[PDB]
Design a protein around this ligand. Structure first.
Ligand code: GDP
Ligand code: MG
Length: 169
């Protein structure tokens, strides 16, 4: 039979984790989705000829107990590490997410895709080079997205599944 993959969407508050996830799941852009809600969604997709089931956790940051964060990192098979291209702090936070996920999984090889979201907005502060360089330093893909226009959205999630498949192989 087919396989279910656990994908985890991480990043600073307001970078567009929820907007990206809802676009993938429901095919519309949600302007106002409570920043404090953490939920998961299932979606069956075909990627490279193989059907699979995505179980996507849209994270919202601190948990009641940090042990709960550690648990979703341990069970998570691939991570979408999202920053917003107009928020340098959210980009610098990626260093922390990369470290923390590796630390919790006690692994040097964790499937991830770096996502620079809000690419439809003006006055970018994080340039493509910075982000491309960081992703290269991690050995992972970098994709620029807009949850509003859908630029790169499917690409980001499907690329993450490909990265999970490569890790498991
Ligand atoms: N213009 C634009 N706004 C976005 C995009 N992604 C998210 N937003 C907005 O940015 C804010 C934060 O989005 P949200 O999905 O709630 O971020 P989260 O806290 O990471 O889940 C919201 O007001 C969204 O409308 C995007 O790609 N483009
Ligand atoms: Mg959210």
């Amino acid at each position: 039979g087919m396989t279910e993959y656990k994908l985890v969407v991480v990043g600073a508050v307001g970078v567009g984790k929820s907007a990206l996830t809802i676009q993938l799941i429901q095919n519309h852009f949600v302007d106002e989705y409570d920043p404090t809600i953490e939920d998961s969604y299932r979606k069956q997709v075909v990627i490279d000829g193989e059907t699979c089931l995505l179980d996507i956790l849209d994270t919202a940051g601190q948990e009641e107990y940090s042990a709960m964060r550690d648990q979703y990192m341990r069970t998570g098979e691939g991570f979408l590490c999202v920053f917003a291209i107009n928020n340098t702090k959210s980009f610098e936070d990626i260093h922390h997410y990369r470290e923390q996920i590796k630390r919790v999984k006690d692994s040097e090889d964790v499937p991830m895709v770096l996502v620079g979201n809000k690419c439809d907005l003006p006055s970018r502060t994080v340039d493509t080079k910075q982000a491309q360089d960081l992703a290269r330093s991690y050995g992972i893909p970098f994709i620029e997205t807009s949850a509003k226009t859908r630029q790169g959205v499917d690409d980001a999630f499907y690329t993450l599944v490909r990265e999970i498949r490569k890790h498991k192989e």
